[PDB]
Symmetry: C2
Subunit: 188 residues, 2 copies
């Protein structure tokens, strides 16, 4: 009866956008797996923070399904996610079974690369808007967090807390999100 979250960690990922959702989700009792795209080895993030993943993506793929798949941002991290066939397979499967997909900052551009959720309203970091909108396959929003159907997107590192709490609310409900929020000393 425990919800499961998959966080895909690639080199160049934004470490703040990785750690905040992982931390907040585990505070909410969600079983989170931080999966390294390239394997089990430590991952150097965009600002040189080095994080040890819980498993390789290959091994984590076999222990599905996951109630949410989380794509952190970071320009180079998002590019590596966009180029990975393994990510394409995971996202298409998640879309077919109507599971939640969450991406923040530059992360949403991986959805375009893999043709995920066309027709949805999405947001990105302002610097990633043009890339996300190439072809007009999505409708753009400037909301700090945007949720359309099974696609949940957010804008940047400064929205990571709201991004993470939105995932918790979608999975465990509004009361759990509120209980997890209070000890964090968030402003609003």
């Amino acid at each position: 009866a425990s919800k499961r979250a998959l966080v895909i960690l690639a080199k160049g990922a934004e470490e703040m956008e990785t750690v905040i959702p992982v931390d907040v989700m585990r505070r909410a009792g969600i079983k989170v797996t931080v999966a390294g795209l390239a394997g089990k080895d430590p991952v150097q993030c965009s600002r040189d923070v080095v994080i040890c993943p819980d498993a390789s993506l290959e091994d984590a793929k076999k222990e599905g399904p996951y109630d949410v798949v989380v794509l952190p941002g970071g320009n180079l991290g998002a590019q590596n996610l966009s180029e990975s066939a393994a990510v394409k397979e995971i996202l298409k499967e998640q879309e077919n079974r109507k599971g939640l997909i969450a991406a923040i900052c530059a992360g949403p551009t991986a959805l375009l690369a893999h043709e995920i959720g066309f027709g949805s309203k999405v947001t990105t970091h302002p610097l990633a808007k043009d890339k996300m909108m190439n072809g007009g396959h999505y409708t753009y929003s400037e909301n700090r967090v945007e949720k359309d159907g099974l696609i949940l997107t957010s804008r940047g590192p400064g929205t990571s807390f709201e991004f993470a709490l939105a995932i918790v609310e979608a999975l465990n409900g509004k009361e759990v999100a509120a209980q997890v929020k209070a000890p964090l000393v968030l402003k609003d």
Copy 2:
């Protein structure tokens, strides 16, 4: 002409309170060293995020001095910082040379353990107030970020961004802090 920051990482540290200041400070061009209290080995943080430090505290001690020493929170992390004689030596030295000392959430309780900055106005996480105020050696504040002399304190994970930008403003000035802040998509 480059400022240097020391971040002391112990088991049980709050990983959000560690990664956000490290990330933000490196965005500001500060040379940050994440030093493992127990050595070079990977550190399991409070919510099971595993971070590889840049160096052992022993080795980082020899490459001082640092313009700021940063103590993350996390109840068990702060306890390990409070029990470490090496931390006591680093903090007393930093106080004598009038360098900046920054601690967030439960981190400030290490200042009491090591008799640092008595008489200063400080803040902590609400759950750490009673511990910090044992003896009445500080004056308590409920501000999200508090700076009194060379002691800079903050309340919790949700204040980490303001905590980090305050460090940047103290070291590199208000203009650099504002430039670093804008791409983060912070609310206020």
